[PDB]
Every structure is written in C-alpha cells, then in structure tokens.
Amino acid sequence: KPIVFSGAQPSGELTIGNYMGALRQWVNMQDDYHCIYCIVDQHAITVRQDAQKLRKATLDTLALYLACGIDPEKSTIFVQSHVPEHAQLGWALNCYTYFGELSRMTAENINAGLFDYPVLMAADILLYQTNLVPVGEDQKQHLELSRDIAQRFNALYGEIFKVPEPFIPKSGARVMSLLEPTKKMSKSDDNRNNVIGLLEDPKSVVKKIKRAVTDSDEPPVVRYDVQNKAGVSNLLDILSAVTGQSIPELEKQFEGKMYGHLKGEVADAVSGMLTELQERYHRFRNDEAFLQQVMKDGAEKASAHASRTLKAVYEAIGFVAKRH
Amino acid sequence: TKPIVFSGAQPSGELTIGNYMGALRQWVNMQDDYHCIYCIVDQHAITVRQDAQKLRKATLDTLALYLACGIDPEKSTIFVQSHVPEHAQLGWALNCYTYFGELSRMTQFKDKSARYAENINAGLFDYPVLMAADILLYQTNLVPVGEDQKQHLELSRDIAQRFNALYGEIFKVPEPFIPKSGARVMSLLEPTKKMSKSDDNRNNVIGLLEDPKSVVKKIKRAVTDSDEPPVVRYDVQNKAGVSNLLDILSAVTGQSIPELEKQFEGKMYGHLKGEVADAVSGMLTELQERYHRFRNDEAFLQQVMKDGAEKASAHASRTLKAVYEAIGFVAKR
Ligand SMILES: Nc1ncnc2c1ncn2[C@@H]1O[C@H](COP(=O)(O)OC(=O)[C@@H](N)Cc2c[nH]c3ccccc23)[C@@H](O)[C@H]1O
Numbered sequence: 324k325p326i327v328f329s330g331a332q333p334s335g336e337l338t339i340g341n342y343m344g345a346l347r348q349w350v351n352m353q354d355d356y357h358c359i360y361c362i363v364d365q366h367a368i369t370v371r372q373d374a375q376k377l378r379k380a381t382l383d384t385l386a387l388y389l390a391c392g393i394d395p396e397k398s399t400i401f402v403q404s405h406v407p408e409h410a411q412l413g414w415a416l417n418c419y420t421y422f423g424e425l426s427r428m429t430a431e432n433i434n435a436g437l438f439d440y441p442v443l444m445a446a447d448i449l450l451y452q453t454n455l456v457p458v459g460e461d462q463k464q465h466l467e468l469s470r471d472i473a474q475r476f477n478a479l480y481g482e483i484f485k486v487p488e489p490f491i492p493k494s495g496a497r498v499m500s501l502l503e504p505t506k507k508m509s510k511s512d513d514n515r516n517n518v519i520g521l522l523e524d525p526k527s528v529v530k531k532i533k534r535a536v537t538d539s540d541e542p543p544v545v546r547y548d549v550q551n552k553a554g555v556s557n558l559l560d561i562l563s564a565v566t567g568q569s570i571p572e573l574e575k576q577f578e579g580k581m582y583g584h585l586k587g588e589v590a591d592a593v594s595g596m597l598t599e600l601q602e603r604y605h606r607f608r609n610d611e612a613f614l615q616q617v618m619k620d621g622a623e624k625a626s627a628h629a630s631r632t633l634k635a636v637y638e639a640i641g642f643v644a645k646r647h
Numbered sequence: 648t649k650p651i652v653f654s655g656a657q658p659s660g661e662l663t664i665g666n667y668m669g670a671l672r673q674w675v676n677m678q679d680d681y682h683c684i685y686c687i688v689d690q691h692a693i694t695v696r697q698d699a700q701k702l703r704k705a706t707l708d709t710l711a712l713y714l715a716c717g718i719d720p721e722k723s724t725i726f727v728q729s730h731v732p733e734h735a736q737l738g739w740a741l742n743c744y745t746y747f748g749e750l751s752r753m754t755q756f757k758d759k760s761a762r763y764a765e766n767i768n769a770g771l772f773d774y775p776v777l778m779a780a781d782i783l784l785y786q787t788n789l790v791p792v793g794e795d796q797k798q799h800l801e802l803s804r805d806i807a808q809r810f811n812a813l814y815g816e817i818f819k820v821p822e823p824f825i826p827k828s829g830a831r832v833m834s835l836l837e838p839t840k841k842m843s844k845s846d847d848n849r850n851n852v853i854g855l856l857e858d859p860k861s862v863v864k865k866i867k868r869a870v871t872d873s874d875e876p877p878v879v880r881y882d883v884q885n886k887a888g889v890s891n892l893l894d895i896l897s898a899v900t901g902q903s904i905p906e907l908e909k910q911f912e913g914k915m916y917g918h919l920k921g922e923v924a925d926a927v928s929g930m931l932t933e934l935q936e937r938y939h940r941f942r943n944d945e946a947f948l949q950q951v952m953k954d955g956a957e958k959a960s961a962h963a964s965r966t967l968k969a970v971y972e973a974i975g976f977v978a979k980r
C-alpha cells in the first residue's frame with residue numbers, strides 16, 4: 324500500500340467541516356493505504372501555552388480521532404514526542420535546508436521553533452517513506468519544501484527518501500461558516516458562532532443553526548444556489564453531507580417550506596450525527612488504560628519504521644554508528 | 648555528587664594548538680576535581696558541509712585525540728553527540744524558548760555565513776540552541792571553552808534562566824571556564840585573526856596531528872613587527888605577533904607573561920621563537936606518540952563510545968523527562 328502521513332494538532336478543536344470532509348473520507352480508506360496519524364505536540368509548543376492544557380489536548384485529540392473511526396489496528400496513530408527520530412531527523416535536515424527558504428516561508432521577537440518548524444514537518448513526512456500527504460492550501464508551501472529537501476538529499480547520497488506527493492482529490496462535503504457562508508468553516512475561526520464543534524450538545528447546535536445567515540427571498544424558497552443563496556445552500560450541503568440525501572431530493576422534500584423547517588432538520592440531523600460520535604469519544608477518552616496502550620503500540624510501530632530511515636540518513640551523512 | 652563539567656569539539660577540520668589551549672588543556676586538568684563529560688559534536692560539525700568518509704574518520708580522530716591529550720575514560724564520560732537522541736530532542740524543545748533575534752545577532756553565524764555563502768543553512772543558524780541543549784541536558788555547572796564561544800554560552804544561560812522562570816528548577820545555569828592564557832590563540836601569518844581549525848592557508852595553523860618539523864618551520868615564519876630594537880613585550884595592538892607567541896609559550900609552560908618578559912630581556916625574536924618551537928614541538932611529539940596507540944585500536948575506541956553513550960544517556964534521559972513533564976507532553980510509556 325502507499326504510505327499516507329497526516330499531522331494532527333493537539334490544540335485543535337475539530338468542527339463538522341473537519342469531520343464530514345477530510346476525516347470521514349480518510350476513515351473509509353484505512354485498508355486502501357498504510358495511514359499514519361501523528362499528534363504533533365512538538366509543533367504545538369511553537370506557540371506558548373499552558374502545560375496541563377497541552378497534555379489534556381493531546382489526549383482529547385487522540386480519543387476524538389479514535390471516535391471518528393481511526394482504527395489503531397489498521398492505521399498507525401501516535402504522539403510525535405514519543406518517537407525521538409522526528410527531532411533527530413529534524414536537526415539533520417536543518418543542515419540541508421537554506422536559511423533563505425525558511426525566511427521566505429509565507430520579527431526578532433519570533434521564537435526559533437516558529438521559524439524552524441517547516442524542517443521538523445519535512446522530517447515528520449520523510450521519516451516514514453511517505454508517498455502521499457493530504458494538505459490544506461496553507462500547508463502547501465511546507466510540503467513543497469519537504470519535496471525539495473528530499474530531492475536535494477537524494478541527489479547527494481542516493482535514494483534515501485521517497486519524494487512525497489500531495490493527496491489531490493478533495494473530500495466532497497462542503498461546509499461553510501454559518502454567519503459568513505462565503506468563507507469555509509474552519510476550526511481556527513475566532514467567531515465560534517461560525518462553527519459547530521464535534522463535542523457541542525443539541526441545545527448549542529440549535530442555537531447556532533437558528534442564527535445562521537440565509538436570504539431575503541419572498542417567498543422563502545429552499546433551493547441550491549451558491550451565488551445568490553449562499554446561506555441556504557450551505558444548510559442544504561450540511562444536511563446532504565449528514566444524511567446522504569442528494570440536493571434535488573432535499574429541494575423536493577422542502578418544497579413549499581420556509582427556512583425555519585430547514586434549520587430545524589439541519590440541527591436535528593447534525594446532533595443525531597454528533598451524539599453517536601460523542602458516545603464513542605467520552606467512552607474512549609475516560610479509559611486511560613486504552614489510550615495508553617494505543618499510544619504505546621502506535622509509538623512502537625512508528626519507531627520501527629522511523630529508525631530504519633534515520634539509520635540510512637545517518638549512514639549517508641557519515642556519522643559513526645551507535646554502539647548498541 | 649561533584650559539580651558537572653560539560654564541553655565538546657567538532658569532528659571537522661583538524662584540531663589545532665588553539666583548540667588545545669582554549670579547551671582541551673582545561674578538560675584534562677578538571678577530571679578529578681569535577682564530574683567531567685566530553686563530547687564529539689558530530690551533529691554540529693555537519694552545519695558546514697562534510698564529506699561522509701571525512702566525517703567518520705574525523706569523529707574517530709577526535710575521539711583518539713581526547714584520549715591522547717589525557718582524557719581518561721575511567722574518570723570522564725566520552726561520547727559521540729549523535730549516539731544520544733536527547734540532544735536533538737531538547738534541541739527542538741529549546742527552539743521554542745529561543746528568540747530569532749538572539750540567533751541572527753550571533754558573531755559565529757555571521758562569520759560562517761560570509762565564508763560559506765553557498766551553504767547558509769538552518770543548522771548553522773540554529774547552532775546555538777543545540778549547543779544549549781548539549782550543556783543543559785547534564786545539569787552542567789562549568790563549561791570549559793575558548794573565548795570565541797563566550798557569546799554562545801551566554802545564550803545557554805539566558806535560555807536556562809528563561810525556561811526555569813516558567814517551569815521551576817529544571818536546568819542548572821552554567822558558567823564559562825575560559826583560561827587566563829591561550830583562550831584565543833591567533834593565526835601565525837595574521838595575528839589579528841583567530842587561529843582556525845579549517846584555515847585555507849595551512850601556514851597560519853599549528854595542527855595537533857601535524858609533523859613537528861613542519862610546526863617548527865611555521866613558528867620561525869610567524870610574523871612579528873618592525874620594532875627597532877626588537878623587544879619581546881606584550882602589546883596586542885602594536886605587537887600582535889610577538890604577543891601571540893608569548894601567549895602560546897605561557898599556556899604551554901605555565902609561566903606568566905611578566906615572567907617570560909623578564910626572561911627575554913636583552914633577547915630578540917630568535918630567542919622567543921626558539922623557545923616557542925621547542926615547547927610546542929616537544930608537546931606535539933608526546934601527544935602524537937600516545938595518539939597512534941589509541942587511534943589504531945578500534946576495539947578500544949568502540950568500547951569508549953559504547954560505555955560513554957550509556958553513561959550520557961542516563962543523565963540526558965532524566966533531564967529530558969523533567970523538561971517534557973514541565974512543558975506538558977504526555978509521557979512516553
Ligand atoms: N584559536 C583558538 N584559540 C583558543 N581556543 C579555540 C580557538 N579556536 C577554537 N577554540 C576553542 O576550541 C573548542 C572547540 O571548538 P570547535 O570549533 O571544535 O567547537 C565549538 O566551537 C563549540 N561550539 C563546540 C560545542 C558544541 N556544543 C558544545 C557544548 C559545550 C561546549 C562546546 C560545545 C571551543 O571551546 C573553542 O572555543
């Protein structure tokens with residue numbers, strides 16, 4: 324199988340956009356690819372934050388990914404800091420990365436971790452002979468750097484690394500912000516009323532969906548039109564993504580119906596989806612023995628592959644081999 | 648337990664009399680008085696592009712040179728940097744508590760960038776943070792280095808204090824141990840420039856593994872000054888070459904500059920250079936004699952690296968565990 328690598332931020336608070344788009348897509352392709360999920364706690368500390376919240380957030384992220392359907396028997400899921408090889412290769416690749424490349428990444432008070440993390444990201448990918456990396460637009464420059472580092476290192480020492488590719492085909496589900504249906508729903512939003520988080524209760528979902536922007540059409544008509552009726556179209560897309568019903572099916576279902584009925588059905592459908600997900604989440608999250616065993620097994624698998632690459636990197640560079 | 652000494656040297660170029668006087672001399676003398684840990688910093692060496700065969704050979708050369716200088720593996724921990732993963736691990740973590748402006752202002756980064764304009768890499772920029780990690784891993788009290796590493800060590804102190812201020816008594820704040828004489832041995836044909844272990848002009852340098860006969864000839868050709876009459880006197884501004892020769896003689900013999908100045912009253916630069924040549928040539932002959940016994944004994948060099956890496960890993964893992972707990976990582980099972 325081709326190897327897929329994804330880096331999951333611990334501090335992230337996932338939305339229905341994250342789940343119904345990319346994550347649900349990838350949960351169903353775990354037998355097609357050798358999928359690797361790395362909870363990137365070493366990347367997280369580039370932003371200063373409360374230590375106890377970071378530890379909590381790492382375990383929250385682990386349980387949530389497991390709740391979404393990531394299978395630790397099929398996929399490799401692990402914590403970044405538990406595999407030393409990431410930091411080790413990170414340093415090695417610094418010496419084959421131009422300062423210029425990092426300065427040009429899209430002043431004196433910035434920490435060196437924030438300046439240097441694209442090299443650690445390159446190490447995260449290249450450690451596991453990664454074939455494919457599913458990235459968003461804002462991470463595309465970083466993937467290109469990892470491809471450039473890999474080719475540069477390979478040209479000097481032979482084919483040590485696989486040159487990774489972006490995972491091109493996009494999810495399918497379109498989830499836009501509730502008060503700004505032109506902008507995509509993103510976990511990074513400051514206006515929380517634009518998003519619906521995966522751990523939101525049914526009362527919170529009703530509140531946010533009720534407030535969601537629609538249009539001033541008279542009569543109100545539930546029809547799909549991203550240009551003229553962005554808000555109503557987003558509500559249809561969300562409902563479609565949840566239930567699997569096509570857009571023209573929903574358009575027929577809501578014939579002669581106001582936006583109040585649509586919003587009611589959207590809220591009900593999303594919370595129906597989020598309840599089964601939350602059940603799994605809280606069950607996994609409160610079982611510390613389960614989470615510890617997943618992290619141990621995951622790190623053991625990751626380390627097996629990671630150490631083989633780093634050995635070849637170290638041999639190529641010419642370091643004296645460690646005496647075990 | 649004794650206070651801890653930590654220091655390192657790169658397996659790149661060929662270590663000089665400068666590297667000896669500024670660092671290695673002090674390393675040997677500190678072994679009983681303090682708990683000493685010495686490192687061959689191969690991860691730092693690759694910030695300048697190395698040939699793979701040259702790096703491997705130079706790592707083992709440097710190890711053998713420590714042993715030849717008198718670094719006893721029964722007294723001190725001797726290890727290769729890349730053999731202990733914790734250096735790279737704490738190296739990354741400390742990037743997040745190091746400012747960009749601190750690294751860009753570094754003299755060594757600027758000097759090396761001008762020299763290797765075709766390879767101004769991120770490793771060369773990030774050099775001080777990994778160096779800080781090297782020191783802070785072992786609860787280090789003293790760091791014996793030459794004058795040129797003063798700025799790097801000052802940042803290690805700032806990082807340690809900055810980290811401790813947030814999280815508690817995780818690191819010891821290290822102190823420099825820079826010698827009185829021989830802290831910055833200067834180049835023989837350019838006494839205003841520091842002696843480099845990778846100088847393009849070999850006549851500037853006294854290599855520790857260089858033929859003594861070649862070294863004596865280099866001392867004879869070292870530039871002095873136009874003073875009439877010639878006078879053996881210490882004056883860095885006006886008599887840089889003579890002052891550098893006196894500094895080298897002082898560091899090798901243990902005699903003070905005023906003691907040597909009095910000794911060379913009524914003498915000129917022939918006497919000075921004769922004494923410097925005799926003292927240095929005698930030192931290098933003995934050193935090189937021990938070196939080949941160590942360097943050609945691969946089984947012994949392998950055992951030193953194994954034992955040393957094991958001892959270092961025990962200290963390093965303890966510190967990294969505490970660092971990781973403090974910043975809020977989930978602890979490894
Ligand atoms: N002309 C000279 N005169 C007197 N002393 C000199 C001269 N040139 C060099 N030195 C000193 O030799 C030591 C090794 O230098 P390196 O370039 O190998 O290597 C260096 O410059 C360090 N960054 C290696 C290192 C890495 N991590 C560490 C942690 C603690 C101490 C040292 C290190 C140094 O002490 C240096 O000050």
Ligand SMILES: N[C@@H](Cc1c[nH]c2ccccc12)C(=O)O
Nearest residue numbers: 328329330331363366444447448
């Ligand atoms: N930089 C990514 C996280 C990440 C770290 N390493 C990666 C490797 C591949 C993909 C993603 C990652 C983010 O901020 O979202």
